[PDB]
């Protein structure tokens, strides 16, 4: 097999040669793909450098309180930093701004029982719960901060309670010249008098019948703040510890907005631990055995209520 075996090979080098020029088409093409591929993922890397969007935004407008902020030109209810006159460090609060120009600075809200109010002293002094720009989260602002605002300038602040049963029926209750003392005064609570509001002056005490004394023993004006780890109540045995919350007891209460959250409203003596009522009650409006569905305590300069004029 001279020029026979070799005849089969002197041209068989052009047979397989169709895998050299051919296998450089791919290397020159694939290589190119990547060059741009690198470019592509580069655009991608660019796309993701930013962190998720936090729907919670804060407003750049500060003030001594929400009304002051409302004056500056705030139009929407949201979180804001306020620094009361005597205060050293500012803090976030939820401001409620209506179209009329009133700037309510809220210090308490219940709406789902999502947060436990069975908190100690410190906790009730510094604040707990969460702030949302949509006021759809329950919390407690903090005695200290409450004290600071209701005391700066010493100009008439008015308290407004807003309740709502499990039937979407609401009701207010106002109090003129509202104020809370310093820790040295165990953050005592005082108000000049009960203004309007269709919910009833529960702060004035209520007669539960059990005894003729109930009526005084359930008033809260002039009462100091109390927690399970800090008595200061008129009762000789600690309402706070029993009824499990933080409030201004006076041999307990008639109004109890930091009480246990009972779903549906109606509760009973058996449900409760010590047997006594501890729901979010507001006697002058519902029974001591009907815990509200929502609760809100906001404050605003009194003059924003007595009408008069404006300036």
């Amino acid at each position: 097999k001279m020029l026979e075996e070799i005849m089969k090979y002197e041209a068989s080098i052009l047979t397989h040669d169709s895998s050299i020029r051919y296998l450089q088409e791919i290397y020159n093409s694939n290589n190119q793909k990547i060059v741009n591929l690198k470019e592509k993922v580069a655009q991608l890397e660019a796309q993701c450098q930013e962190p998720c969007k936090d729907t919670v935004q804060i407003h750049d407008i500060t003030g001594k309180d929400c009304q002051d902020i409302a004056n500056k030109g705030a139009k929407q209810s949201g979180l804001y930093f306020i620094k009361p006159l005597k205060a050293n460090q500012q803090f976030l609060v939820y401001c409620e701004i209506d179209g009329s120009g009133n700037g309510w600075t809220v210090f308490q809200k219940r709406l789902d029982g999502s947060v436990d109010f069975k908190k100690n002293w410190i906790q009730y002094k510094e604040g707990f719960g969460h702030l949302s720009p949509t006021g759809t989260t329950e919390f407690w602002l903090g005695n200290e901060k409450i004290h600071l605002i209701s005391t700066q300038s010493a100009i008439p602040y008015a308290l407004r309670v807003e309740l709502e049963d499990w039937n979407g029926r609401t009701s207010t209750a106002d109090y003129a010249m509202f104020k809370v003392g310093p820790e040295a005064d165990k953050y005592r609570l005082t108000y000049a008098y009960f203004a309007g509001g269709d919910a009833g002056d529960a702060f004035d005490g209520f007669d539960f019948g059990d005894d003729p004394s109930d009526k005084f023993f359930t008033s809260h004006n002039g009462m100091q703040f109390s927690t399970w780890d800090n008595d200061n109540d008129k009762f000789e045995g600690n309402c706070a510890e029993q009824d499990g919350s933080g409030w201004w007891m006076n041999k307990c209460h008639a109004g109890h907005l930091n009480g246990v959250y009972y779903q549906g409203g109606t509760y009973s003596k058996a449900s409760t631990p010590n047997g006594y009522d501890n729901g979010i009650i507001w006697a002058t409006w519902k029974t001591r055995w009907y815990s509200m569905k929502k609760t809100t305590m906001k404050i605003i300069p009194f003059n924003r209520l007595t009408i008069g004029e404006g300036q």
Partner: peptide, 4 residues
């Protein structure tokens, strides 16, 4: 509430 009020107590005994």
């Amino acid at each position: 509430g009020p107590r005994p």
